[PDB]
Amino acid sequence: MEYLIGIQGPDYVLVASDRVAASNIVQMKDDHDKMFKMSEKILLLCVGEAGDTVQFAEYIQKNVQLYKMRNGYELSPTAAANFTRRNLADCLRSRTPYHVNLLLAGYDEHEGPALYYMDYLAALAKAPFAAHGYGAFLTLSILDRYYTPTISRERAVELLRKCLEELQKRFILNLPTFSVRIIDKNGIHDLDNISF
Amino acid sequence: MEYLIGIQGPDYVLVASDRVAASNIVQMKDDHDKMFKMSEKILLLCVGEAGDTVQFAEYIQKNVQLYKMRNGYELSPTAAANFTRRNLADCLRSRTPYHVNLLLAGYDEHEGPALYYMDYLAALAKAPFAAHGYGAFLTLSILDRYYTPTISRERAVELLRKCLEELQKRFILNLPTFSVRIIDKNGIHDLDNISF
Amino acid sequence: MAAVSVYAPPVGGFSFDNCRRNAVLEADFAKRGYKLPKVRKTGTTIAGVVYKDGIVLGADTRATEGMVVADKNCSKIHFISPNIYCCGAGTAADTDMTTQLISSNLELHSLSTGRLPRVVTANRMLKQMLFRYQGYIGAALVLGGVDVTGPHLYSIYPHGSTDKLPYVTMGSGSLAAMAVFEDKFRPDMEEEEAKNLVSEAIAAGIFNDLGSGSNIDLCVISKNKLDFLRPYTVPNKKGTRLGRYRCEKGTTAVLTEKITPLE
Amino acid sequence: DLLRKGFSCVKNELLPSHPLELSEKNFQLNQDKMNFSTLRNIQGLFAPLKLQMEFKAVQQVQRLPFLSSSNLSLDVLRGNDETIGFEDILNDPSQSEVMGEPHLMVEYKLGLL
Amino acid sequence: RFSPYVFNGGTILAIAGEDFAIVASDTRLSEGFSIHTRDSPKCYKLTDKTVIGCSGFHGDCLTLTKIIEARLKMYKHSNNKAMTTGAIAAMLSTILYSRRFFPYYVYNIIGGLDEEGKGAVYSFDPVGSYQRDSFKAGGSASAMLQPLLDNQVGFKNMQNVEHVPLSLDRAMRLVKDVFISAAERDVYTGDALRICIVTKEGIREETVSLRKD
Amino acid sequence: TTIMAVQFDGGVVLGADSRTTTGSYIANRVTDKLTPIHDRIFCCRSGSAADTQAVADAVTYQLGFHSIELNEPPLVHTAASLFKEMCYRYREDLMAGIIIAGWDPQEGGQVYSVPMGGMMVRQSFAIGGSGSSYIYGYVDATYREGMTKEECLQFTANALALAMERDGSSGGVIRLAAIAESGVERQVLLGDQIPKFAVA
Amino acid sequence: TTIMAVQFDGGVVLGADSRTTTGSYIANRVTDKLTPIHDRIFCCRSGSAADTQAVADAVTYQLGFHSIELNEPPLVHTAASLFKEMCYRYREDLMAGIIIAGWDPQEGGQVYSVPMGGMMVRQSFAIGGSGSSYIYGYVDATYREGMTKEECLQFTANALALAMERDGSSGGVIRLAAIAESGVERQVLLGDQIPKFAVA
Amino acid sequence: YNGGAVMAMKGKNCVAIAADRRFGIQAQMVTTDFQKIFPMGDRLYIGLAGLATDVQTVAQRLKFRLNLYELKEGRQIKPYTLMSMVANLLYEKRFGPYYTEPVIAGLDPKTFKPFICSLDLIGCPMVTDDFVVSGTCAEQMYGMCESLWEPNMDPDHLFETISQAMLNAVDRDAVSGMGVIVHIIEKDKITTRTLKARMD
Amino acid sequence: NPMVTGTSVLGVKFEGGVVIAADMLGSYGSLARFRNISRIMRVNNSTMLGASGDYADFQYLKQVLGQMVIDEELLGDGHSYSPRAIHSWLTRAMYSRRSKMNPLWNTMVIGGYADGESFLGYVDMLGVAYEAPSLATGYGAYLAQPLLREVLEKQPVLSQTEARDLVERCMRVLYYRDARSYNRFQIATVTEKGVEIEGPLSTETN
Amino acid sequence: LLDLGPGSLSDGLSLAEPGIEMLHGTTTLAFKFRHGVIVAADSRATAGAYIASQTVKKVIEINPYLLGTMAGGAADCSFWERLLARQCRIYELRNKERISVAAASKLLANMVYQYKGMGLSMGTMICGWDKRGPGLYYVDSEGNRISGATFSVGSGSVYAYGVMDRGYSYDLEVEQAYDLARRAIYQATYRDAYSGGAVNLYHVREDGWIRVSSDNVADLHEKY
């Protein structure tokens, strides 16, 4: 499969995803931006089975934008997470949900940074850090090891680099590049792709 | 899975295999010498399902050595290939064969270099070049493209490097290193590992 | 904000939707998992007789989740109407909701009519409901009561079929209960005799079955009296505790404590 | 080929969720057909025509679809004013719990969309 | 078409003190939703210092207890001494594993005295992974019994409590009370309680009553 | 379950056992399998109890309503057709085999034999249910034409006794009903009254 | 397939149909289902043809050898036991139901009724095969004690006719055999001679 | 799958509700702060146990109905009524069950009488006088509470008892634990404590 | 898989011996095919036997179990298979047959009176063997065992007449409430004198 | 007599829920730095969702030259290393020299290769200090036999791979390697649900293994 990771620090959220979009023993594209911009301060990492990920993410993105334009203010990250959970839970019935594993990462001017984990059953849970895909198993221990509630941005990015390097060392799949963005008081910030 | 490749030139045989031995989403070892030395001039690349590969290769290696010591001369590469085929075919019955995909590469002082392809059904076939594993699909076209019956050693090794680079580019699995040996009039020659 | 998506939820009544989640969440089955709760089997030995001038119903009071005794005093004699009662075996929730809805229907009927409802009416309502639901509502009921037309006793099976008998038994311990009746039953018993017979019949289903056993309930319905004897007999008592476990104060360690004064 | 409404498709669904999905969801129409066949066969075509003819004009004016409705006169036209079932207690339309934009729901009732 | 196995139920429990080794079991033999009998004890006496208690499929319980007795007699004949507790446990592990591909659907707990006279309890599995424990419970009700034993014997999760050594009287009180509790919630447990007290002076048996329902 | 009916001169004689098995256990052993559709028309129920009971109730509804509308006793063929419709439209969802039989002023005693599936066919005598296989030969060998009421009753009792002694899903007491112009004369053959045939 | 045997006073009368179906097509319609095990001992074969034929041949082998060794006619019970052994050891691999019946000097006419499974039980009359279900009741109702040879033959013919008219795996011609002390007197009832019972 | 475990305990005008804190996918602990005890009143909590995707849905399906109830009637809900609408909400999806088994514990607002209950996934009111349990660790809590429970326990002893029941029951189940939360509801105040549990 | 089965065997201890009973019928499915077979053996002069389930396997046991009794009585030493010994041997035979996935489809009830102490043993197809004052097989275990245990818990020691009457009442209950039953059953009683089988006994009910 | 259980049925030379069970094994670990091999494992063994025991010694004590490791299935391992220890001792008796780790791993692999796909769930990991240096092999049920510097197997093997890989170094001094193994196993039992109990720690130094410590994860949680 693929890989997502999120780290929440004092007043920011660091997230990273692979760029590989495979279809079979072959990979079809290596610049896959797996990261959907819900609003000016919310990012929605979506992974899962082909087709459903993009459709569900597009639906939620259009709804967050629609709410923003209908009201003037913007959905708070907790509001976006809960609304996405409500939307994904209700589809665990007819349109065989969508097996979309989500990782919503956002910042609020009022509540501080927030990172929400979501399995394909729509089981929402706030967490200081999380990960999806088979790669999560290899990196979660390293995240547990060197993570403290108080982490400067540079320490967080080098921790992410540590996780990705070890994932390169062990994980059987070939994930050569990872798109990284940070979310803080000033919008969303792209960071230099971690490449090998 | 894993990857084997063999190239036969005028008077040599070039072979290369990965060094990754995976057990699950994790790889357990990255120096896996997948290459069994049948005799002074015969190499037996064995891949397939775990357990059966090593056992079958050990059986055949011990038999080639036993023949050599019982007689004084050594099995010719065609003899080793046919004997291995006879052994693998007869086990397509009781001990559920062994799903061992083979690639026997050898040199004879009399007959010139020889490369034999073998699926897990024991279907022997001499070929100027071959490959096993899911990686064979990606590299066989490139082999067809720049291969001529007359290839110097340096051209052959750079062709192999081309195949491996493109396999790195496309193949979803992570195969970072490949052990390379050449077989010519003077025994078996180790070549520098192709690493990325 | 009344979001534009589903036209509306204009019709409640038994979802499906949300069933394919059930179908493909093998979890419990294959993929380890298996927390995945299952339902119940409450109602395990229920019996009824028709003595001289009324009905005597009986039932144990054990409710088993799986093979663990969940409740030890689960009442299984439900109220249908001031002269009609109904024991309940089979799946627990189905029997509960079915009996409650039939009680509501029946006493709406009796309210608009202005006279005491007949048992046969409740028998028909239950029969037609269960048949409508094709038996997926597993609810085995023993219907009993006394109208102007004398005592009546019905036994409703989950699939819709009903049997009118002078004595019926249902539940996991139905067979063990039926033994007592087939050997000791006579027509035209007096009140005390019928109560003793039913007590033995339920007692057979208590000691001789695993799915059953607790206090014994009775419901004596006559032409004019309705005794809801609960619990009629306490055959089994907790074995007296010998040790004095008696968790002391300060025995447990507390990381964080929050206190909120309410009033 | 659109969305912003849950991509109204359900094509993957097709097959019912249960032998008790469509039948239990639409037992109202099923009972209507049961009684009409009982009346076409024995009473006449006039009686089913009367029932259709009335049931038309009990629903035309009750309330706009985006609001809850009781539908009184319909209930005492069918026996439902003293027979109450599982469709009355489970997820009542009063607390419909899911609504769309009023206008958009009152148009389709007539069928603009 | 033929289930070679059936679950007859039954609960066992062992406690290893300093001078004793309690082995106790209910005596109700069940099948599906029926009580075959109420007086089928599930503790068997092997040696003057070792007592086994089996639970699960009753047919394998009978076969295994007879094989074990035969093997003790063969050991006594060849080696000219009664087996120790540890030797019996190792034998039982080997015997259980010999049917790895047709397992003995039995749960076994060995309770007795080791070579130095201190108590010892060995807990097994249907294919013979044994280990020494200070206490154990197996069978249908094992899930109900084990946490309470962890609390009261091993003093788990309690703070600032004196670790008194477990006395024989308190051990009897504890076993009787835990089976009184278990008989309440587990349907497979009740109708009696055979308790074997393995001490240096032999094996004495106490039997009390549970809920009969 | 060995319901049976024979048409004699001027009326019909029904017949049924009383045994409702739910496997190998006898859930009910005095079942009345002769449900009266109308005043002089009867049905016999075989198969799943719930389906036959619901079908009989629906048919008695429709037939009572029809009889009121026509202001006449219904023809037996009318009840047979009403059973045929319900048993045929829902042939997949039902497991009912019915032996509709009765009397009407026009055609006299009639016996229709709607099987599992929706057929409707007239018979001089009709049998059904699980145990009927063990008395096909007996009824073929013994039935004659022009039998009176009494020997028809004896024939029915004999056939039912033969079936109940052999089939496990059939036993108990024999419920009979002799429908004629005057009215039904029900009886129950119990214990000693059941004909017994000397086992070797 | 409705093989049948009855013990009368002083001997036994067999009986069988002749119809070997391979589905709904009649592979053979004059099959002789009365294989002579010995001079005065017979078997009747029901079930899969191959299994019964092989079992009968094996039994006639063993029984001829045994009779030679004992220098006496074999007891019918001996042949019954020989059938029981083969039908019981290979009960899983066989689908044979045999009606061994014959006569011997000691015990007179005997009828043993080894079913599918390996039982061996004596009967005053034994029937088997697919069509026997439709004549259980008839034979229960009509069998008496002390019947002569002739009325035994008539009883057998009637029962077989009743079965063949009803069962599809049973029909054709009726092969009879009246074993007695003197010897077997075989006959075939064909066409008109088969008793006919007036259909309504 | 996700795991989970909750209980309730009655006492002398005080009740105690507890829950574990593991939110994991089938082996994999993800967070240790999953909420399973939801405030539905001043002295009325509900504890869910089951699928995390349905703990989060039923607790919001039910807050919606509860708020509507409170606004429409203007009174804090009695615990028994809250018990009765959980049955309705769950039984609504009778064939589509919400995989969760709530436990309700609280005090009567006007009487301060302890109340506890437990419901299966389709909704069956089970009011007990001592305790209720739910979740994966079903047997372990039953065994612990049947032994440590006492009647008329003052709140601190109640807290000790429920704390020990949690700590010793979740420790013997792999997919539940990672800390324990305990709420002691009194006639005056609410105490929420987090206990020291093994984090393995 | 069985083809011809027997329904139920009852047996209750009493002061001086053991009485067991079993009806005479073999069901070929839902059909009462054979109506005069006997399902009660007299093993030796102290032990009888009854059995339910496949009847061919019961006949095989009659062949085998009978044969060992002769094989020992010819020796003429005087030791005889005590009732407990037959019960153990049968248990072992059926456990061995189960372990080879070729079970003897039966559930016997061995009863015997030796050395002044009665005996009642149960063995099923899976080798589940035990002892109890009252036994029942098939739906006997649901319809007759409850009455037997109810009567025994009040009075634990029964006389001959009360035990025989109790068995008769249980047989009436089985005949009423068991599909695969017949109204002709056999009662076998063992005392110090020896095995005694009365039959056939009907059930003249009201 | 039919079959008549002959005697002790069948038990001779065993050496080469309904019953279906054998407890479990999980989260083992070993690497091979310069001062020898060290082996770490937890002590927990589950049965479905129910812990059967919290004190399961998963580091088999094959002989005072060489260690094993339990994982995947407790009885299958325990029995097969026990028989392997028997074979190693017989070899040492005959040839009068301790058997090398390479030989023992091949013995175990060949022994387990038969029964291929017959249901074994072995996950062993042989360790020792043979004549050639440190020894470390991963012999499992399907026939893998691979040497290597670092390994870890069990349900919580992946977490150990993570922490161990980022902590590992071949020139790691002893007391730091102890802490590394402690941390790796503790993190693995922190995330995984099937791993718990006490973290056993063995050091395979020069001739003779030694036991380092057995700390409980409850106390380690406070320690970290």
Side-chain angles (χ1 to χ4, degrees), chain J residues 1-97 99-222:
Chain J
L1 49 120
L2 187 22
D3 188 67
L4 227 233
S8 89
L9 230 280
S10 41
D11 56 335
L13 214 111
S14 48
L15 12 140
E17 194 43 73
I20 167 86
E21 235 284 307
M22 41 141 2
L23 296 194
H24 270 328
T26 167
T27 300
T28 68
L29 187 152
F31 46 88
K32 178 198 82 180
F33 58 93
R34 186 179 295 276
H35 289 71
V37 192
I38 63 171
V39 170
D42 65 78
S43 53
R44 186 97 90 63
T46 74
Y50 167 70
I51 294 91
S53 179
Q54 285 271 10
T55 57
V56 175
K57 297 303 123 176
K58 292 185 185 295
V59 186
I60 308 284
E61 273 279 14
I62 281 185
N63 66 38
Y65 286 147
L66 192 140
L67 295 196
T69 286
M70 189 176 327
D76 300 319
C77 298
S78 311
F79 185 91
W80 288 121
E81 293 83 3
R82 190 168 185 80
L83 192 168
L84 167 58
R86 170 194 163 270
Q87 263 304 350
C88 287
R89 176 84 193 144
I90 296 169
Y91 180 103
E92 192 216 340
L93 287 199
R94 296 174 163 158
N95 297 296
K96 292 177 71 68
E97 66 183 1
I99 193 166
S100 67
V101 185
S105 60
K106 174 52 102 183
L107 271 161
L108 186 45
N110 277 352
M111 266 169 48
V112 185
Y113 183 45
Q114 301 148 3
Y115 309 135
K116 181 68 180 294
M118 261 186 78
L120 297 182
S121 179
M122 233 183 55
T124 62
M125 185 180 288
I126 307 298
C127 295
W129 190 258
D130 72 22
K131 284 322 311 203
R132 187 179 297 112
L136 179 60
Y137 295 84
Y138 167 67
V139 173
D140 72 37
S141 66
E142 40 265 30
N144 300 69
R145 174 189 152 281
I146 60 171
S147 168
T150 186
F151 288 105
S152 175
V153 298
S155 60
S157 71
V158 291
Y159 304 98
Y161 273 130
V163 176
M164 171 175 58
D165 273 328
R166 306 302 315 177
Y168 181 76
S169 174
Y170 183 76
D171 193 330
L172 188 65
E173 51 206 90
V174 183
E175 185 65 26
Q176 288 172 48
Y178 288 176
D179 293 9
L180 173 55
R182 290 196 219 290
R183 292 296 319 230
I185 299 289
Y186 160 70
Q187 300 296 160
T189 182
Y190 183 83
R191 282 270 157 194
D192 188 341
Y194 290 153
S195 297
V199 181
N200 297 115
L201 197 66
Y202 283 81
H203 191 155
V204 171
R205 298 173 315 103
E206 57 83 19
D207 186 74
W209 44 263
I210 73 168
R211 192 163 336 187
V212 176
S213 77
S214 169
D215 291 331
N216 217 16
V217 298
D219 313 300
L220 299 185
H221 193 47
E222 192 294 335

Side-chain angles (χ1 to χ4, degrees), chain G residues 9-27:
Chain G
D9 164 23
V12 55
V13 165
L14 277 296
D17 63 358
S18 61
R19 181 167 281 197
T20 303
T21 64
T22 57
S24 305
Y25 168 65
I26 298 284

